[PDB]
Amino acid sequence: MTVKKLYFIPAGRCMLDHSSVNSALTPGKLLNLPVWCYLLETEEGPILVDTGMPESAVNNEGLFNGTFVEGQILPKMTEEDRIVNILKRVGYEPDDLLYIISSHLHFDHAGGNGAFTNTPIIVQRTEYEAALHREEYMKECILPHLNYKIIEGDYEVVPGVQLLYTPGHSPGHQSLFIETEQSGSVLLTIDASYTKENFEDEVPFAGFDPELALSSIKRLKEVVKKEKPIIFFGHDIEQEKSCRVFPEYI
Numbered sequence: 001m002t003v004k005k006l007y008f009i010p011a012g013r014c015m016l017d018h019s020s021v022n023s024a025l026t027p028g029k030l031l032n033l034p035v036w037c038y039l040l041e042t043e044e045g046p047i048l049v050d051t052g053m054p055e056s057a058v059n060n061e062g063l064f065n066g067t068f069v070e071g072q073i074l075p076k077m078t079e080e081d082r083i084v085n086i087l088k089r090v091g092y093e094p095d096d097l098l099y100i101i102s103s104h105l106h107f108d109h110a111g112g113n114g115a116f117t118n119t120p121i122i123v124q125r126t127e128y129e130a131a132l133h134r135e136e137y138m139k140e141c142i143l144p145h146l147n148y149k150i151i152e153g154d155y156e157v158v159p160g161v162q163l164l165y166t167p168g169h170s171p172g173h174q175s176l177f178i179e180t181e182q183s184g185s186v187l188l189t190i191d192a193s194y195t196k197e198n199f200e201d202e203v204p205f206a207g208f209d210p211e212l213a214l215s216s217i218k219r220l221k222e223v224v225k226k227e228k229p230i231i232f233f234g235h236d237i238e239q240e241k242s243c244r245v246f247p248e249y250i
């Protein structure tokens with residue numbers, strides 16, 4: 001069985017210093033990077049991958065003023081980018097969803113998790129445990145009473161939807177390998193590589209453990225050598241130019 005439709009859904013944006021996509025660059029220039037969620041229409045029901053930024057980021061570029069990351073992260077989020085609004089426009093309410101998949105619990109990926117109080121939220125144990133104590137993590141991304149479906153390592157969500165454990169960018173980061181009806185094998189690196197250059201050329205980028213992130217890239221390259229998928233990266237301004245986005249699908 002294959003996934004019926006894979007949708008790339010813009011979920012607002014976020015400014016990061018350009019050293020975030022290339023650690024060798026000298027800090028001083030911000031990049032307006034895309035924030036994504038993905039919607040998978042499957043035989044078993046719709047599945048949402050990531051949930052955008054938290055309510056606190058709405059019309060609040062200075063969210064991280066007063067913190068250890070002041071001026072280094074500026075969310076670009078409007079009321080329209082709240083995940084429930086995104087879903088409502090697409091044609092879903094939170095309780096319609098079969099699963100939420102959290103690639104990781106960074107604020108640009110799990111900020112909307114609180115909206116889903118019934119749907120199982122699939123997240124790596126190592127990411128969940130990290131989010132409990134590491135300072136990067138926002139409280140909005142680790143709410144205690146959500147219906148977490150905690151997994152460890154690789155995992156098949158439904159036929160055609162595979163999670164690949166790719167730690168490094170964050171302690172329990174996971175990527176997706178999807179088989180779609182229209183396109184066949186698709187690799188969503190999520191933040192296992194922000195840009196094509198991080199993947200192909202192994203250019204270092206923002207992450208908790210760069211060494212581990214490299215090994216996760218090498219692991220993904222082995223998958224690619226075997227499966228020859230089309231590959232989409234996490235925060236790639238260049239690639240975004242040519243991405244088929246909602247209402248188009250792959």
Ligand SMILES: [Zn+2]
Pocket residue numbers: 104106169170191
């Ligand atoms: Zn991240």
Ligand SMILES: [Zn+2]
Pocket residue numbers: 106108109191234235
């Ligand atoms: Zn990210």
